[PDB]
Paper text:
The effector [name] binds the [name] retromer subunit, blocks retrograde vesicle trafficking, and promotes intracellular bacterial replication. Here, we show that the 29-kDa N-terminal domain of [name] (RidL2–281) adopts a “foot-like” fold comprising a protruding hydrophobic β-hairpin, which determines the interaction with the [name] retromer subunit and displaces the regulator [name] from the retromer. Thus, the hydrophobic β-hairpin of [name] is critical for binding of the [name] effector to the [name] retromer subunit and displacement of the regulator [name].
The N-terminal domain devoid of the β-hairpin crystallized in space group P212121 with two polypeptide chains (called molecule A and B) in the asymmetric unit. These molecules exhibited a root mean square deviation (RMSD) of 0.756 Å over 205 residues among each other, and mainly differ at the F-loop, which was partially undefined due to the high flexibility in molecule A. Superpositions of the Δβ-hairpin mutant with the wild-type [name] domain over the same 205 residues resulted in RMSD of 0.872 Å and 0.962 Å for molecules A and B, respectively. Thus, the N-terminal [name] fragment lacking the β-hairpin adopts an overall structure that is very similar to the parental fragment. Interestingly, the fragment lacking the β-hairpin no longer co-localized with the retromer and was found throughout the cell. As expected, the Δβ-hairpin mutant did not reveal any detectable binding to [name]. The SEC analysis of [name]-ΔF-loop or [name]-Δβ-hairpin deletion proteins did not reveal any changes in the elution behavior compared to [name], indicating that the mutants are correctly folded. In contrast, the addition of RidL10–258-Δβ-hairpin or buffer only did not result in the elution of the retromer.
Author numbering: 8 to 78, 82 to 242
The structure:
C-alpha cells in the first residue's frame, strides 16, 4: 500500500476547515495539534505514537487513517513502522507534519482573534510574526521554548507565515465586510477586475497596505461581499 503521511496532512486541513463552524470540534482539534506540537519530530517513535494515540479522533473524521487489515506484520509493529508513518517521506516527513501542525494551530487561534490581532499579523514581516506569535501565548499556540526545542520561530516556515497571513486576510476581510456601512466601497471591491483595483478598494475598507502582498479574493469573501451588497 502506502504510508499515511499525506493522508494525515490532508485530514489536518479538512478537519480545520470544518472546525470554523464547530466550536466543540475546534477544541478537540486544538488539543491534538497541541500534542503534535510538543512532540519532537526528531524522535520518530514518539512522533508515530502521539499520532496513533489519537485514533479516536482520527476515526471520527477518517477511519482509513488508522486502519490496518492485519494478516505481514501485526498492528503494533505496523504502528511503529514507516509503513504507517514514513519518517523518510520525501515531502511529508515528520518535520513537515510538525510544521503543518503548528501552522494549523495558529490559523485555529486566528479564528477567534480580534481585529487588531489580524492587522498586526498582516503588517508584520515573517520575523516579526514569529516574535509576535511568541508573544501571544497561548492564544495562537504554545510557541515557547519549553515545548519547542527549538522555539518557534523555527517550526513556522516563511511559507507557513504566508499561509497564516492568507488566513488572517480572509478573516479580516470578512470582518470589514460585516462592519462597513460604505455600500459603494463594498461594491468597488466586489467589482474589482484586477489585484491593484482590489487593493485600492480593500485598503480603503481598512485592509492594511502591508498585507497587499497576500491580498486575494476567495470564494467565501466574494460570497459574503455579494450578500452584503444586495442586503438592502
Amino acid at each position: 500500500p502506502s504510508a499515511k503521511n499525506k493522508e494525515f496532512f490532508d485530514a489536518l486541513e479538512e478537519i480545520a476547515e470544518s472546525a470554523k463552524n464547530d466550536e466543540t470540534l475546534r477544541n478537540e482539534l486544538a488539543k491534538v495539534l497541541d500534542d503534535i506540537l510538543k512532540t519532537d519530530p526528531s524522535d520518530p517513535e514518539a512522533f508515530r505514537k502521539i499520532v496513533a494515540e489519537h485514533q479516536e479522533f482520527w476515526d471520527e473524521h477518517d477511519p482509513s487513517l488508522m486502519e490496518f487489515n492485519e494478516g505481514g506484520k501485526s498492528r503494533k509493529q505496523y504502528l511503529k513502522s514507516d509503513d504507517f508513518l514514513n519518517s523518510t517521506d520525501p515531502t511529508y516527513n515528520f518535520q513537515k507534519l510538525h510544521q503543518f501542525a503548528a501552522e494549523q494551530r495558529v490559523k485555529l487561534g486566528l479564528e477567534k482573534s480580534d481585529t487588531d490581532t489580524l492587522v498586526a499579523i498582516l503588517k508584520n514581516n515573517p520575523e516579526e510574526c514569529r516574535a509576535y506569535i511568541e508573544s501571544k501565548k497561548p492564544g495562537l499556540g504554545n510557541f515557547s521554548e519549553g515545548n519547542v526545542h527549538g522555539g518557534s520561530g523555527g517550526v513556522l516556515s516563511d511559507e507557513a507565515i504566508k499561509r497564516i497571513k492568507e488566513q488572517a486576510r480572509d478573516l479580516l476581510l470578512l470582518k470589514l465586510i460585516n462592519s462597513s456601512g460604505n455600500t459603494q466601497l463594498l461594491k468597488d471591491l466586489r467589482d474589482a477586475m484586477s489585484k491593484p483595483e482590489a487593493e485600492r478598494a480593500a485598503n480603503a475598507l481598512g485592509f492594511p497596505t502591508e498585507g497587499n502582498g497576500v491580498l486575494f479574493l476567495s470564494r467565501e469573501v466574494v460570497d459574503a461581499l455579494e450578500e452584503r451588497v444586495e442586503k438592502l
